[PDB]
Design an enzyme around this catalytic site. Sequence first.
Site, PDB file in Angstrom:
ATOM      1  N   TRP A 169       0.862  -1.159   0.000  1.00 26.68           N
ATOM      2  CA  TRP A 169       0.000   0.000   0.000  1.00 26.68           C
ATOM      3  C   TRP A 169       0.905   1.218   0.000  1.00 26.68           C
ATOM      4  CZ3 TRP A 169      -1.600   2.627   5.089  1.00 26.68           C
ATOM      5  CH2 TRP A 169      -2.598   3.570   4.870  1.00 26.68           C
ATOM      6  N   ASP A 209       0.461  -5.403   9.788  1.00 29.92           N
ATOM      7  CA  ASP A 209      -0.563  -4.496   9.327  1.00 29.92           C
ATOM      8  C   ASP A 209      -1.777  -5.363   9.094  1.00 29.92           C
ATOM      9  OD1 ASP A 209      -2.329  -2.726   8.282  1.00 29.92           O
ATOM     10  OD2 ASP A 209      -0.971  -1.901   6.734  1.00 29.92           O
ATOM     11  N   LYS A 222     -12.782  -1.575   7.164  1.00 32.09           N
ATOM     12  CA  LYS A 222     -13.442  -2.463   6.246  1.00 32.09           C
ATOM     13  C   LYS A 222     -14.451  -3.370   6.921  1.00 32.09           C
ATOM     14  CE  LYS A 222      -9.366  -1.001   4.628  1.00 32.09           C
ATOM     15  NZ  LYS A 222      -9.565   0.235   3.855  1.00 32.09           N
TER      16      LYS A 222
HETATM   17  C1  LIG Z   1      -3.067  -2.197   3.892  1.00 30.11           C
HETATM   18  C2  LIG Z   1      -3.785  -1.012   4.516  1.00 30.11           C
HETATM   19  N1  LIG Z   1      -3.379  -0.556   5.719  1.00 30.11           N
HETATM   20  C3  LIG Z   1      -3.942   0.493   6.346  1.00 30.11           C
HETATM   21  C4  LIG Z   1      -4.990   1.137   5.774  1.00 30.11           C
HETATM   22  C5  LIG Z   1      -5.566   2.382   6.468  1.00 30.11           C
HETATM   23  O1  LIG Z   1      -6.826   2.057   6.955  1.00 30.11           O
HETATM   24  P1  LIG Z   1      -7.628   3.084   7.776  1.00 30.11           P
HETATM   25  O2  LIG Z   1      -8.621   3.678   6.741  1.00 30.11           O
HETATM   26  O3  LIG Z   1      -8.288   2.234   8.787  1.00 30.11           O
HETATM   27  O4  LIG Z   1      -6.653   4.098   8.207  1.00 30.11           O
HETATM   28  C6  LIG Z   1      -5.501   0.730   4.518  1.00 30.11           C
HETATM   29  C7  LIG Z   1      -6.594   1.404   3.892  1.00 30.11           C
HETATM   30  N2  LIG Z   1      -6.273   1.553   2.465  1.00 30.11           N
HETATM   31  C8  LIG Z   1      -7.350   1.806   1.493  1.00 30.11           C
HETATM   32  C9  LIG Z   1      -7.863   3.220   1.615  1.00 30.11           C
HETATM   33  C10 LIG Z   1      -6.767   4.245   1.600  1.00 30.11           C
HETATM   34  O5  LIG Z   1      -5.599   3.906   1.234  1.00 30.11           O
HETATM   35  O6  LIG Z   1      -7.057   5.433   1.937  1.00 30.11           O
HETATM   36  C11 LIG Z   1      -6.870   1.480   0.116  1.00 30.11           C
HETATM   37  O7  LIG Z   1      -7.389   2.106  -0.840  1.00 30.11           O
HETATM   38  O8  LIG Z   1      -6.000   0.581  -0.056  1.00 30.11           O
HETATM   39  C12 LIG Z   1      -4.876  -0.344   3.906  1.00 30.11           C
HETATM   40  O9  LIG Z   1      -5.251  -0.838   2.703  1.00 30.11           O
END
Ligand SMILES: Cc1ncc(COP(=O)(O)O)c(CN[C@@H](CC(=O)O)C(=O)O)c1O
Lengths: 396, 396
Positions: free
Chosen positions: B130, B211, B246
């Site tokens: 990510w 994570d 989620k």
């Molecule tokens: C692997 C991962 N870790 C942490 C988070 C952060 O989650 P919180 O919203 O609870 O802070 C996301 C959310 N990722 C989403 C949304 C984003 O990146 O804003 C994604 O699109 O992958 C994620 O995909």
Amino acid sequence: MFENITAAPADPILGLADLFRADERPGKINLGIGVYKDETGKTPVLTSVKKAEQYLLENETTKNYLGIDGIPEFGRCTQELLFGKGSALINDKRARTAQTPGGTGALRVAADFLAKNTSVKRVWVSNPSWPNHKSVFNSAGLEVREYAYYDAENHTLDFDALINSLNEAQAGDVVLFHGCCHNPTGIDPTLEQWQTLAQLSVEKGWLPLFDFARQGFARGLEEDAEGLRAFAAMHKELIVASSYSKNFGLYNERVGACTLVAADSETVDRAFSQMKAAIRANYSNPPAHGASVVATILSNDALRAIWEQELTDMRQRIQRMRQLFVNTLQEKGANRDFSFIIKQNGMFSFSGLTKEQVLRLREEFGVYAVASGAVNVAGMTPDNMAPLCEAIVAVL
Amino acid sequence: MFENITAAPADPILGLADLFRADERPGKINLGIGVYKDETGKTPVLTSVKKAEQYLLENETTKNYLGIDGIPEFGRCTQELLFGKGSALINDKRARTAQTPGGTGALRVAADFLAKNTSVKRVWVSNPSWPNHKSVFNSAGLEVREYAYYDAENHTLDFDALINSLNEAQAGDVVLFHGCCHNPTGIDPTLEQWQTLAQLSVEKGWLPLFDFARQGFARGLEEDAEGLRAFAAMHKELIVASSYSKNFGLYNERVGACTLVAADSETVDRAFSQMKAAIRANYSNPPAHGASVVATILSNDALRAIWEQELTDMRQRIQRMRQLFVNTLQEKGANRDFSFIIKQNGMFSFSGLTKEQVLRLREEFGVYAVASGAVNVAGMTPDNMAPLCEAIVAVL
Ligand SMILES: Cc1ncc(COP(=O)(O)O)c(CN[C@@H](CC(=O)O)C(=O)O)c1O
Ligand SMILES: Cc1ncc(COP(=O)(O)O)c(CN[C@@H](CC(=O)O)C(=O)O)c1O
């Protein structure tokens, strides 16, 4: 990895609170924390709030992420509150607001922003100030200097001392100002002083940072902002961190904002982008609930009227306790004049007590003031005044 | 001060979403943000959540600050989800949990903590991962290195390359692991690999940081924690950053947790205090709403039963879309063989598209995937499938 980690020193405010619980003594009062309390000693949910909440319960159809800066209406409503409905700042699309997790979150956000995108190294705070100011700035890797403020002797604003420390400050330095209801003294500058500080600031190249955590508690929503407004009238740049924790009774919801002001629209925009990047690498996007409740209320004329009235009630209750406090102080034998108190604003009063007096108050007496020596007038009640007043006299 | 600030680059994720928002063309598909969508193409509020929010509305008597670490019940619940009802880490009181503003918030808190109270200098993240990972860590001053993970050629986990790259990692380095449902690959390790990964980690001295943002979206609540549990069974220390965004559809309420695990209760307690100090200088205390919602549901057998069913439905809908996607592609004429999809977990799937294919797929027909070539399976519906696959085949 963690074997050698050292324990962290207890939090000057939070720490004292933990001990309040463990003090298991019956009639113990607790005047040491900047939260509002009612005549019954409770911190209730505002009526406007409970209403805005039924509404949100009924109307929300998604909990999808807000944008990095949060709810737009939230932003416009705050700027209006800060700067006034017909502001040029607003008109010139000269400010941008980010919804943050509380007043603390804004400070932090402002901190990271400055440390990584500007030449800023030092932030000047007053002596005394809310203990947390230092920790937040230091966390962003910024220096915190101190300016004289309070006159231990006269229980007033030491204007000359203040203007005098401020001279060790360089152009490009951040000077932090408490918008109104100074924490922990309850001493604010006059409109005339604010105007003087405003001219000085531009003359000197300081970057004003306002900390607005209790708007509506000194004199009223608008009045309380004349200071900020005087600065905004001559500054090209400025930063504002506000909180809706006290005024909306939304403490645990984390409702505040960080407003960025620049010479023009193209500039705030460019700058706001870095501010957003900062938020993104911290908490991502803000918590909707409390900000939502805020927007709903500030946007609905009916709710907003109930709210302002609730605010006024809170404020008047405080003003009642100051008078009642100095009065009982008097009728209780105290032979020191506590009348300066009456001229103080907000929840906080710098009583005059000494570090030892404070210890004593709480050791023998069960009365918990702030490490700094200040008392929260809002924790006083017609019921607890006597006992509380006996104890203070007993230590003068 | 702001005059020369340089505009921040657009965020790889958030940036596309906005781009997608400024085009009202017909059959516009949006597959590049990792939020769950229903068959109606919406992100609804769970019924368990709605049920919980009423309760709260009916019971809450104050909005007074939560302690730095949040709701106790919230912490225990999280821990049980994470480790298991009869975990030793739990019995030995070897873990401490802080309620944070979402998973990003937890990661940031872990980061600040590590940077200020430890010898950690580097964090190892997968390639790809990510994109916000690198940002939170770098913001805390830590450096990030990448380990191989993905086998472009075979659409799997390159176990050799992974282990082979990890070898360059030293003792005292932090290695980041996605607990389940790798983002953006969908490729997770088997239990056997986790076990291998666990043992090597112990002997090489890495500090594991998990994570966990989608517990429940791969195989199930428990099943998903398997990998975490293998590590936990043999590490003295480890950090867990979890999200309830989620799994509870609470995206905007900012509900997460940072779990710290040490060799014993005394160590954990001392380290944790350093963690709370980090929070306090950041956002101070966490937002109550989302977390209370989680706590309430998790504590109630009834709401709990309802909630797990809704999770099961979300999970099964995704599984459905995986199959339907490979079938439609099949029919619609694809040359490549996309069965690997089926084996992926959660919301994402690395389709195996190039950078250009994604550019085209979006300039050409309005299909919005992630720069990485990942595609959010949860944004696919029976309606949009055909058009989708038609566009995809058009670009292979
Ligand atoms: C692997 C991962 N870790 C942490 C988070 C952060 O989650 P919180 O919203 O609870 O802070 C996301 C959310 N990722 C989403 C949304 C984003 O990146 O804003 C994604 O699109 O992958 C994620 O995909
Ligand atoms: C002057 C001042 N600025 C900012 C803040 C931060 O406000 P938020 O709660 O919106 O983050 C406070 C809160 N100070 C209170 C409570 C506290 O410090 O926790 C006080 O007791 O002084 C404050 O007094």
